[PDB]
Amino acid sequence: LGKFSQTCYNSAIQGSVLTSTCERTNGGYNTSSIDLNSVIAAVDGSLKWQGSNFIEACRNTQLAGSSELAAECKTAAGQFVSTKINLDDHIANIDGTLKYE
């Protein structure tokens, strides 16, 4: 599951949107995007999968390494900490589109 990076290139992240050109399964190349906001939540400054409403409490999000997502999230006390999470942990590539698995 996930490992979209294996068949995805030119990936970019800005806020809560992952966008990357991937190789289609039927056609040629397809560059779609998937809001990480529908699969990521912010709790005490910790990004976890199967969640939502993280961007509202997080900012300065970007692509790290290749398939990782670095960003700052406000803790329960109100302090922005450095949160990270592997996109390949679920984000997959279907027919050249970025999906969640």
PDB file of N, CA and C in Angstrom:
ATOM      1  N   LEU A   1       0.833  -1.197   0.000  1.00  0.00           N
ATOM      2  CA  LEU A   1       0.000   0.000   0.000  1.00  0.00           C
ATOM      3  C   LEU A   1       0.871   1.253   0.000  1.00  0.00           C
ATOM      4  N   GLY A   2       0.321   2.331  -0.540  1.00  0.00           N
ATOM      5  CA  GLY A   2       1.016   3.599  -0.577  1.00  0.00           C
ATOM      6  C   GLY A   2       2.137   3.658  -1.598  1.00  0.00           C
ATOM      7  N   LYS A   3       3.333   3.943  -1.102  1.00  0.00           N
ATOM      8  CA  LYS A   3       4.524   4.014  -1.943  1.00  0.00           C
ATOM      9  C   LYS A   3       4.244   4.661  -3.303  1.00  0.00           C
ATOM     10  N   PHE A   4       3.444   5.726  -3.326  1.00  0.00           N
ATOM     11  CA  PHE A   4       3.154   6.397  -4.592  1.00  0.00           C
ATOM     12  C   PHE A   4       4.451   6.930  -5.202  1.00  0.00           C
ATOM     13  N   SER A   5       5.372   7.339  -4.330  1.00  0.00           N
ATOM     14  CA  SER A   5       6.658   7.881  -4.761  1.00  0.00           C
ATOM     15  C   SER A   5       7.392   6.924  -5.700  1.00  0.00           C
ATOM     16  N   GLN A   6       7.079   5.633  -5.622  1.00  0.00           N
ATOM     17  CA  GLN A   6       7.741   4.655  -6.484  1.00  0.00           C
ATOM     18  C   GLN A   6       7.360   4.888  -7.943  1.00  0.00           C
ATOM     19  N   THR A   7       6.136   5.369  -8.167  1.00  0.00           N
ATOM     20  CA  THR A   7       5.645   5.630  -9.525  1.00  0.00           C
ATOM     21  C   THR A   7       5.136   7.064  -9.642  1.00  0.00           C
ATOM     22  N   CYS A   8       5.696   7.955  -8.818  1.00  0.00           N
ATOM     23  CA  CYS A   8       5.321   9.373  -8.839  1.00  0.00           C
ATOM     24  C   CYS A   8       6.567  10.243  -8.754  1.00  0.00           C
ATOM     25  N   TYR A   9       6.587  11.310  -9.553  1.00  0.00           N
ATOM     26  CA  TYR A   9       7.726  12.230  -9.585  1.00  0.00           C
ATOM     27  C   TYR A   9       7.243  13.673  -9.679  1.00  0.00           C
ATOM     28  N   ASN A  10       8.153  14.613  -9.431  1.00  0.00           N
ATOM     29  CA  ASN A  10       7.816  16.033  -9.466  1.00  0.00           C
ATOM     30  C   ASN A  10       6.711  16.331  -8.461  1.00  0.00           C
ATOM     31  N   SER A  11       6.820  15.717  -7.283  1.00  0.00           N
ATOM     32  CA  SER A  11       5.831  15.916  -6.230  1.00  0.00           C
ATOM     33  C   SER A  11       6.068  17.238  -5.516  1.00  0.00           C
ATOM     34  N   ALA A  12       4.986  17.836  -5.024  1.00  0.00           N
ATOM     35  CA  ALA A  12       5.066  19.114  -4.321  1.00  0.00           C
ATOM     36  C   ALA A  12       3.970  19.203  -3.274  1.00  0.00           C
ATOM     37  N   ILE A  13       4.247  19.933  -2.195  1.00  0.00           N
ATOM     38  CA  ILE A  13       3.281  20.099  -1.107  1.00  0.00           C
ATOM     39  C   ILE A  13       3.284  21.544  -0.642  1.00  0.00           C
ATOM     40  N   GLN A  14       2.093  22.097  -0.420  1.00  0.00           N
ATOM     41  CA  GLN A  14       1.989  23.482   0.023  1.00  0.00           C
ATOM     42  C   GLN A  14       0.674  23.731   0.751  1.00  0.00           C
ATOM     43  N   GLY A  15       0.743  23.625   2.071  1.00  0.00           N
ATOM     44  CA  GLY A  15      -0.415  23.815   2.929  1.00  0.00           C
ATOM     45  C   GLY A  15      -1.019  22.489   3.327  1.00  0.00           C
ATOM     46  N   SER A  16      -1.827  21.923   2.441  1.00  0.00           N
ATOM     47  CA  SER A  16      -2.467  20.637   2.711  1.00  0.00           C
ATOM     48  C   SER A  16      -2.850  19.958   1.400  1.00  0.00           C
ATOM     49  N   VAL A  17      -2.085  20.259   0.353  1.00  0.00           N
ATOM     50  CA  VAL A  17      -2.332  19.695  -0.977  1.00  0.00           C
ATOM     51  C   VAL A  17      -1.078  19.032  -1.527  1.00  0.00           C
ATOM     52  N   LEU A  18      -1.185  17.741  -1.829  1.00  0.00           N
ATOM     53  CA  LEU A  18      -0.081  16.993  -2.422  1.00  0.00           C
ATOM     54  C   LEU A  18      -0.352  16.950  -3.916  1.00  0.00           C
ATOM     55  N   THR A  19       0.621  17.318  -4.742  1.00  0.00           N
ATOM     56  CA  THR A  19       0.440  17.293  -6.194  1.00  0.00           C
ATOM     57  C   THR A  19       1.680  16.673  -6.801  1.00  0.00           C
ATOM     58  N   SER A  20       1.503  15.678  -7.664  1.00  0.00           N
ATOM     59  CA  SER A  20       2.654  15.014  -8.264  1.00  0.00           C
ATOM     60  C   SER A  20       2.295  14.335  -9.574  1.00  0.00           C
ATOM     61  N   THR A  21       3.217  14.423 -10.525  1.00  0.00           N
ATOM     62  CA  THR A  21       3.035  13.788 -11.819  1.00  0.00           C
ATOM     63  C   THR A  21       3.350  12.310 -11.674  1.00  0.00           C
ATOM     64  N   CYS A  22       2.389  11.456 -12.027  1.00  0.00           N
ATOM     65  CA  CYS A  22       2.571  10.007 -11.918  1.00  0.00           C
ATOM     66  C   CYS A  22       2.274   9.330 -13.244  1.00  0.00           C
ATOM     67  N   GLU A  23       2.813   8.127 -13.405  1.00  0.00           N
ATOM     68  CA  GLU A  23       2.628   7.362 -14.631  1.00  0.00           C
ATOM     69  C   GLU A  23       1.283   6.642 -14.624  1.00  0.00           C
ATOM     70  N   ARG A  24       0.450   6.962 -15.609  1.00  0.00           N
ATOM     71  CA  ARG A  24      -0.862   6.333 -15.723  1.00  0.00           C
ATOM     72  C   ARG A  24      -0.705   4.841 -15.952  1.00  0.00           C
ATOM     73  N   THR A  25      -1.786   4.096 -15.744  1.00  0.00           N
ATOM     74  CA  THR A  25      -1.770   2.649 -15.939  1.00  0.00           C
ATOM     75  C   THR A  25      -2.321   2.316 -17.320  1.00  0.00           C
ATOM     76  N   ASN A  26      -3.228   3.166 -17.806  1.00  0.00           N
ATOM     77  CA  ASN A  26      -3.840   2.983 -19.127  1.00  0.00           C
ATOM     78  C   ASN A  26      -3.225   3.983 -20.115  1.00  0.00           C
ATOM     79  N   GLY A  27      -3.407   5.271 -19.837  1.00  0.00           N
ATOM     80  CA  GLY A  27      -2.879   6.316 -20.704  1.00  0.00           C
ATOM     81  C   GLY A  27      -1.381   6.521 -20.522  1.00  0.00           C
ATOM     82  N   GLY A  28      -0.960   7.790 -20.515  1.00  0.00           N
ATOM     83  CA  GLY A  28       0.455   8.147 -20.365  1.00  0.00           C
ATOM     84  C   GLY A  28       0.759   8.684 -18.980  1.00  0.00           C
ATOM     85  N   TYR A  29       0.875  10.011 -18.864  1.00  0.00           N
ATOM     86  CA  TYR A  29       1.180  10.657 -17.581  1.00  0.00           C
ATOM     87  C   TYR A  29      -0.033  11.443 -17.083  1.00  0.00           C
ATOM     88  N   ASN A  30      -0.209  11.482 -15.760  1.00  0.00           N
ATOM     89  CA  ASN A  30      -1.325  12.213 -15.145  1.00  0.00           C
ATOM     90  C   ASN A  30      -0.844  12.928 -13.890  1.00  0.00           C
ATOM     91  N   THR A  31      -1.177  14.215 -13.785  1.00  0.00           N
ATOM     92  CA  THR A  31      -0.787  15.024 -12.627  1.00  0.00           C
ATOM     93  C   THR A  31      -2.014  15.493 -11.868  1.00  0.00           C
ATOM     94  N   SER A  32      -2.388  14.719 -10.852  1.00  0.00           N
ATOM     95  CA  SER A  32      -3.540  15.043 -10.012  1.00  0.00           C
ATOM     96  C   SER A  32      -3.056  15.502  -8.647  1.00  0.00           C
ATOM     97  N   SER A  33      -4.000  15.811  -7.766  1.00  0.00           N
ATOM     98  CA  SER A  33      -3.664  16.260  -6.419  1.00  0.00           C
ATOM     99  C   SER A  33      -4.640  15.672  -5.411  1.00  0.00           C
ATOM    100  N   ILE A  34      -4.176  15.507  -4.175  1.00  0.00           N
ATOM    101  CA  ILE A  34      -5.008  14.946  -3.109  1.00  0.00           C
ATOM    102  C   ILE A  34      -4.793  15.725  -1.818  1.00  0.00           C
ATOM    103  N   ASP A  35      -5.872  16.300  -1.299  1.00  0.00           N
ATOM    104  CA  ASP A  35      -5.785  17.072  -0.072  1.00  0.00           C
ATOM    105  C   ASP A  35      -5.467  16.148   1.096  1.00  0.00           C
ATOM    106  N   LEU A  36      -4.345  16.403   1.754  1.00  0.00           N
ATOM    107  CA  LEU A  36      -3.947  15.593   2.894  1.00  0.00           C
ATOM    108  C   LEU A  36      -4.831  15.925   4.082  1.00  0.00           C
ATOM    109  N   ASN A  37      -5.670  16.939   3.910  1.00  0.00           N
ATOM    110  CA  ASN A  37      -6.563  17.363   4.976  1.00  0.00           C
ATOM    111  C   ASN A  37      -7.672  16.354   5.215  1.00  0.00           C
ATOM    112  N   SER A  38      -7.946  15.487   4.245  1.00  0.00           N
ATOM    113  CA  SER A  38      -9.019  14.508   4.397  1.00  0.00           C
ATOM    114  C   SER A  38      -8.497  13.190   4.965  1.00  0.00           C
ATOM    115  N   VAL A  39      -7.195  13.122   5.255  1.00  0.00           N
ATOM    116  CA  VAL A  39      -6.602  11.886   5.782  1.00  0.00           C
ATOM    117  C   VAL A  39      -5.533  12.180   6.843  1.00  0.00           C
ATOM    118  N   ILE A  40      -5.458  13.436   7.293  1.00  0.00           N
ATOM    119  CA  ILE A  40      -4.476  13.829   8.327  1.00  0.00           C
ATOM    120  C   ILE A  40      -5.124  14.739   9.381  1.00  0.00           C
ATOM    121  N   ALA A  41      -4.835  14.458  10.664  1.00  0.00           N
ATOM    122  CA  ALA A  41      -5.381  15.238  11.795  1.00  0.00           C
ATOM    123  C   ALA A  41      -4.247  15.765  12.692  1.00  0.00           C
ATOM    124  N   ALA A  42      -4.490  16.902  13.363  1.00  0.00           N
ATOM    125  CA  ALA A  42      -3.487  17.509  14.262  1.00  0.00           C
ATOM    126  C   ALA A  42      -3.919  17.391  15.722  1.00  0.00           C
ATOM    127  N   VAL A  43      -3.145  16.645  16.513  1.00  0.00           N
ATOM    128  CA  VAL A  43      -3.450  16.454  17.937  1.00  0.00           C
ATOM    129  C   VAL A  43      -2.214  16.714  18.797  1.00  0.00           C
ATOM    130  N   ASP A  44      -2.225  17.830  19.525  1.00  0.00           N
ATOM    131  CA  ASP A  44      -1.102  18.193  20.390  1.00  0.00           C
ATOM    132  C   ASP A  44       0.173  18.353  19.562  1.00  0.00           C
ATOM    133  N   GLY A  45       0.009  18.744  18.306  1.00  0.00           N
ATOM    134  CA  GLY A  45       1.145  18.948  17.430  1.00  0.00           C
ATOM    135  C   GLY A  45       1.694  17.647  16.885  1.00  0.00           C
ATOM    136  N   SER A  46       0.797  16.739  16.502  1.00  0.00           N
ATOM    137  CA  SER A  46       1.202  15.437  15.961  1.00  0.00           C
ATOM    138  C   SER A  46       0.306  15.045  14.792  1.00  0.00           C
ATOM    139  N   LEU A  47       0.894  14.878  13.606  1.00  0.00           N
ATOM    140  CA  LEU A  47       0.121  14.500  12.426  1.00  0.00           C
ATOM    141  C   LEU A  47      -0.069  12.989  12.367  1.00  0.00           C
ATOM    142  N   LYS A  48      -1.330  12.560  12.346  1.00  0.00           N
ATOM    143  CA  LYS A  48      -1.671  11.134  12.277  1.00  0.00           C
ATOM    144  C   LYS A  48      -2.586  10.882  11.088  1.00  0.00           C
ATOM    145  N   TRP A  49      -2.551   9.663  10.559  1.00  0.00           N
ATOM    146  CA  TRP A  49      -3.388   9.315   9.413  1.00  0.00           C
ATOM    147  C   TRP A  49      -4.842   9.171   9.837  1.00  0.00           C
ATOM    148  N   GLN A  50      -5.683   8.661   8.923  1.00  0.00           N
ATOM    149  CA  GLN A  50      -7.122   8.494   9.187  1.00  0.00           C
ATOM    150  C   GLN A  50      -7.644   9.632  10.060  1.00  0.00           C
ATOM    151  N   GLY A  51      -7.492  10.851   9.559  1.00  0.00           N
ATOM    152  CA  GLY A  51      -7.937  12.022  10.288  1.00  0.00           C
ATOM    153  C   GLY A  51      -8.139  13.220   9.390  1.00  0.00           C
ATOM    154  N   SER A  52      -8.565  14.329   9.990  1.00  0.00           N
ATOM    155  CA  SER A  52      -8.811  15.556   9.238  1.00  0.00           C
ATOM    156  C   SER A  52      -8.693  16.775  10.154  1.00  0.00           C
ATOM    157  N   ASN A  53      -8.832  17.963   9.566  1.00  0.00           N
ATOM    158  CA  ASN A  53      -8.739  19.219  10.313  1.00  0.00           C
ATOM    159  C   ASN A  53      -7.357  19.381  10.959  1.00  0.00           C
ATOM    160  N   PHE A  54      -6.298  19.278  10.144  1.00  0.00           N
ATOM    161  CA  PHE A  54      -4.920  19.447  10.637  1.00  0.00           C
ATOM    162  C   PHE A  54      -4.344  20.753  10.099  1.00  0.00           C
ATOM    163  N   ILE A  55      -4.740  21.096   8.882  1.00  0.00           N
ATOM    164  CA  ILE A  55      -4.264  22.320   8.256  1.00  0.00           C
ATOM    165  C   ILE A  55      -4.739  23.532   9.043  1.00  0.00           C
ATOM    166  N   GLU A  56      -5.948  23.442   9.587  1.00  0.00           N
ATOM    167  CA  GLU A  56      -6.501  24.548  10.355  1.00  0.00           C
ATOM    168  C   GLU A  56      -5.599  24.885  11.538  1.00  0.00           C
ATOM    169  N   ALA A  57      -4.859  23.883  12.024  1.00  0.00           N
ATOM    170  CA  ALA A  57      -3.960  24.067  13.168  1.00  0.00           C
ATOM    171  C   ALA A  57      -2.509  23.841  12.760  1.00  0.00           C
ATOM    172  N   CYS A  58      -2.235  23.881  11.454  1.00  0.00           N
ATOM    173  CA  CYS A  58      -0.872  23.668  10.958  1.00  0.00           C
ATOM    174  C   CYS A  58      -0.575  24.549   9.751  1.00  0.00           C
ATOM    175  N   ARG A  59       0.709  24.852   9.552  1.00  0.00           N
ATOM    176  CA  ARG A  59       1.139  25.677   8.422  1.00  0.00           C
ATOM    177  C   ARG A  59       2.569  25.328   8.017  1.00  0.00           C
ATOM    178  N   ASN A  60       3.077  26.022   7.003  1.00  0.00           N
ATOM    179  CA  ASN A  60       4.435  25.779   6.528  1.00  0.00           C
ATOM    180  C   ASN A  60       4.635  24.302   6.241  1.00  0.00           C
ATOM    181  N   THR A  61       3.820  23.749   5.345  1.00  0.00           N
ATOM    182  CA  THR A  61       3.925  22.340   4.987  1.00  0.00           C
ATOM    183  C   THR A  61       4.671  22.206   3.663  1.00  0.00           C
ATOM    184  N   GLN A  62       5.492  21.160   3.534  1.00  0.00           N
ATOM    185  CA  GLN A  62       6.269  20.967   2.309  1.00  0.00           C
ATOM    186  C   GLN A  62       6.753  19.526   2.166  1.00  0.00           C
ATOM    187  N   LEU A  63       7.381  19.246   1.023  1.00  0.00           N
ATOM    188  CA  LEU A  63       7.901  17.912   0.722  1.00  0.00           C
ATOM    189  C   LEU A  63       9.321  17.751   1.254  1.00  0.00           C
ATOM    190  N   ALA A  64       9.541  16.686   2.029  1.00  0.00           N
ATOM    191  CA  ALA A  64      10.862  16.403   2.605  1.00  0.00           C
ATOM    192  C   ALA A  64      11.348  15.019   2.181  1.00  0.00           C
ATOM    193  N   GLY A  65      12.611  14.941   1.766  1.00  0.00           N
ATOM    194  CA  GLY A  65      13.201  13.675   1.353  1.00  0.00           C
ATOM    195  C   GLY A  65      12.703  13.185   0.001  1.00  0.00           C
ATOM    196  N   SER A  66      11.391  13.006  -0.116  1.00  0.00           N
ATOM    197  CA  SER A  66      10.793  12.540  -1.372  1.00  0.00           C
ATOM    198  C   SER A  66       9.329  12.153  -1.173  1.00  0.00           C
ATOM    199  N   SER A  67       9.047  11.431  -0.088  1.00  0.00           N
ATOM    200  CA  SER A  67       7.681  10.987   0.202  1.00  0.00           C
ATOM    201  C   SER A  67       7.328  11.247   1.659  1.00  0.00           C
ATOM    202  N   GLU A  68       7.880  12.322   2.226  1.00  0.00           N
ATOM    203  CA  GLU A  68       7.591  12.693   3.618  1.00  0.00           C
ATOM    204  C   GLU A  68       6.977  14.075   3.647  1.00  0.00           C
ATOM    205  N   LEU A  69       6.216  14.357   4.705  1.00  0.00           N
ATOM    206  CA  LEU A  69       5.539  15.647   4.844  1.00  0.00           C
ATOM    207  C   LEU A  69       5.910  16.314   6.153  1.00  0.00           C
ATOM    208  N   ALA A  70       6.688  17.384   6.038  1.00  0.00           N
ATOM    209  CA  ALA A  70       7.122  18.163   7.196  1.00  0.00           C
ATOM    210  C   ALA A  70       6.233  19.390   7.343  1.00  0.00           C
ATOM    211  N   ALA A  71       5.856  19.707   8.575  1.00  0.00           N
ATOM    212  CA  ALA A  71       4.996  20.858   8.822  1.00  0.00           C
ATOM    213  C   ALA A  71       4.995  21.215  10.299  1.00  0.00           C
ATOM    214  N   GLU A  72       4.504  22.414  10.612  1.00  0.00           N
ATOM    215  CA  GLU A  72       4.429  22.880  11.998  1.00  0.00           C
ATOM    216  C   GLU A  72       2.975  22.870  12.470  1.00  0.00           C
ATOM    217  N   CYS A  73       2.720  22.217  13.613  1.00  0.00           N
ATOM    218  CA  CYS A  73       1.360  22.125  14.170  1.00  0.00           C
ATOM    219  C   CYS A  73       1.320  22.623  15.614  1.00  0.00           C
ATOM    220  N   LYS A  74       0.262  23.367  15.934  1.00  0.00           N
ATOM    221  CA  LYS A  74       0.088  23.936  17.270  1.00  0.00           C
ATOM    222  C   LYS A  74      -0.279  22.863  18.303  1.00  0.00           C
ATOM    223  N   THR A  75       0.480  22.844  19.397  1.00  0.00           N
ATOM    224  CA  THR A  75       0.251  21.888  20.473  1.00  0.00           C
ATOM    225  C   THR A  75      -0.959  22.304  21.305  1.00  0.00           C
ATOM    226  N   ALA A  76      -1.362  21.440  22.231  1.00  0.00           N
ATOM    227  CA  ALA A  76      -2.509  21.732  23.083  1.00  0.00           C
ATOM    228  C   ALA A  76      -2.264  22.997  23.897  1.00  0.00           C
ATOM    229  N   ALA A  77      -0.993  23.289  24.158  1.00  0.00           N
ATOM    230  CA  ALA A  77      -0.623  24.473  24.933  1.00  0.00           C
ATOM    231  C   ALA A  77      -0.575  25.713  24.049  1.00  0.00           C
ATOM    232  N   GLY A  78      -0.557  25.513  22.730  1.00  0.00           N
ATOM    233  CA  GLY A  78      -0.516  26.628  21.792  1.00  0.00           C
ATOM    234  C   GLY A  78       0.889  26.898  21.278  1.00  0.00           C
ATOM    235  N   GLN A  79       1.680  25.831  21.089  1.00  0.00           N
ATOM    236  CA  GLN A  79       3.059  25.966  20.583  1.00  0.00           C
ATOM    237  C   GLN A  79       3.241  25.126  19.319  1.00  0.00           C
ATOM    238  N   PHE A  80       3.768  25.766  18.284  1.00  0.00           N
ATOM    239  CA  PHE A  80       4.017  25.097  17.015  1.00  0.00           C
ATOM    240  C   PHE A  80       5.275  24.231  17.105  1.00  0.00           C
ATOM    241  N   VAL A  81       5.091  22.912  16.973  1.00  0.00           N
ATOM    242  CA  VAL A  81       6.210  21.958  17.017  1.00  0.00           C
ATOM    243  C   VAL A  81       6.475  21.446  15.608  1.00  0.00           C
ATOM    244  N   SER A  82       7.552  20.682  15.421  1.00  0.00           N
ATOM    245  CA  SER A  82       7.890  20.151  14.093  1.00  0.00           C
ATOM    246  C   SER A  82       7.329  18.750  13.891  1.00  0.00           C
ATOM    247  N   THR A  83       6.263  18.638  13.095  1.00  0.00           N
ATOM    248  CA  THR A  83       5.635  17.338  12.838  1.00  0.00           C
ATOM    249  C   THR A  83       6.014  16.791  11.470  1.00  0.00           C
ATOM    250  N   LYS A  84       6.192  15.474  11.419  1.00  0.00           N
ATOM    251  CA  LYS A  84       6.560  14.778  10.187  1.00  0.00           C
ATOM    252  C   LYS A  84       5.749  13.498  10.041  1.00  0.00           C
ATOM    253  N   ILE A  85       5.588  13.044   8.804  1.00  0.00           N
ATOM    254  CA  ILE A  85       4.837  11.826   8.538  1.00  0.00           C
ATOM    255  C   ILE A  85       5.130  11.341   7.120  1.00  0.00           C
ATOM    256  N   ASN A  86       5.301  10.028   6.966  1.00  0.00           N
ATOM    257  CA  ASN A  86       5.614   9.448   5.660  1.00  0.00           C
ATOM    258  C   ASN A  86       4.357   9.337   4.796  1.00  0.00           C
ATOM    259  N   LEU A  87       4.387   9.989   3.637  1.00  0.00           N
ATOM    260  CA  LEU A  87       3.267   9.968   2.699  1.00  0.00           C
ATOM    261  C   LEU A  87       3.092   8.583   2.086  1.00  0.00           C
ATOM    262  N   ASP A  88       4.199   7.867   1.938  1.00  0.00           N
ATOM    263  CA  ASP A  88       4.165   6.530   1.357  1.00  0.00           C
ATOM    264  C   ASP A  88       3.464   5.545   2.285  1.00  0.00           C
ATOM    265  N   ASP A  89       3.228   5.959   3.521  1.00  0.00           N
ATOM    266  CA  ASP A  89       2.585   5.084   4.491  1.00  0.00           C
ATOM    267  C   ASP A  89       1.166   4.719   4.045  1.00  0.00           C
ATOM    268  N   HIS A  90       0.598   5.511   3.132  1.00  0.00           N
ATOM    269  CA  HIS A  90      -0.758   5.245   2.640  1.00  0.00           C
ATOM    270  C   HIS A  90      -0.967   5.829   1.248  1.00  0.00           C
ATOM    271  N   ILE A  91      -0.495   7.054   1.037  1.00  0.00           N
ATOM    272  CA  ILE A  91      -0.665   7.702  -0.260  1.00  0.00           C
ATOM    273  C   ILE A  91      -0.123   6.799  -1.360  1.00  0.00           C
ATOM    274  N   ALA A  92      -1.021   6.327  -2.232  1.00  0.00           N
ATOM    275  CA  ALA A  92      -0.649   5.434  -3.336  1.00  0.00           C
ATOM    276  C   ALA A  92      -0.895   6.111  -4.677  1.00  0.00           C
ATOM    277  N   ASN A  93      -0.599   5.389  -5.758  1.00  0.00           N
ATOM    278  CA  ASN A  93      -0.792   5.903  -7.118  1.00  0.00           C
ATOM    279  C   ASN A  93      -1.708   4.972  -7.905  1.00  0.00           C
ATOM    280  N   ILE A  94      -2.902   5.457  -8.249  1.00  0.00           N
ATOM    281  CA  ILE A  94      -3.872   4.669  -9.018  1.00  0.00           C
ATOM    282  C   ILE A  94      -4.113   5.323 -10.374  1.00  0.00           C
ATOM    283  N   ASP A  95      -3.835   4.579 -11.439  1.00  0.00           N
ATOM    284  CA  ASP A  95      -4.016   5.078 -12.799  1.00  0.00           C
ATOM    285  C   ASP A  95      -3.363   6.452 -12.982  1.00  0.00           C
ATOM    286  N   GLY A  96      -2.268   6.687 -12.255  1.00  0.00           N
ATOM    287  CA  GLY A  96      -1.532   7.944 -12.356  1.00  0.00           C
ATOM    288  C   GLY A  96      -2.075   9.042 -11.462  1.00  0.00           C
ATOM    289  N   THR A  97      -3.028   8.695 -10.601  1.00  0.00           N
ATOM    290  CA  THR A  97      -3.628   9.665  -9.674  1.00  0.00           C
ATOM    291  C   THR A  97      -3.207   9.334  -8.250  1.00  0.00           C
ATOM    292  N   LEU A  98      -3.111  10.349  -7.394  1.00  0.00           N
ATOM    293  CA  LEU A  98      -2.715  10.133  -6.002  1.00  0.00           C
ATOM    294  C   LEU A  98      -3.924   9.780  -5.147  1.00  0.00           C
ATOM    295  N   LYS A  99      -3.917   8.566  -4.597  1.00  0.00           N
ATOM    296  CA  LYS A  99      -5.013   8.094  -3.740  1.00  0.00           C
ATOM    297  C   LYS A  99      -4.491   7.777  -2.351  1.00  0.00           C
ATOM    298  N   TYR A 100      -5.415   7.490  -1.435  1.00  0.00           N
ATOM    299  CA  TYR A 100      -5.069   7.151  -0.053  1.00  0.00           C
ATOM    300  C   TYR A 100      -5.348   5.668   0.186  1.00  0.00           C
ATOM    301  N   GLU A 101      -4.367   4.961   0.751  1.00  0.00           N
ATOM    302  CA  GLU A 101      -4.510   3.526   1.031  1.00  0.00           C
ATOM    303  C   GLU A 101      -4.042   3.215   2.448  1.00  0.00           C
TER     304      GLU A 101
END
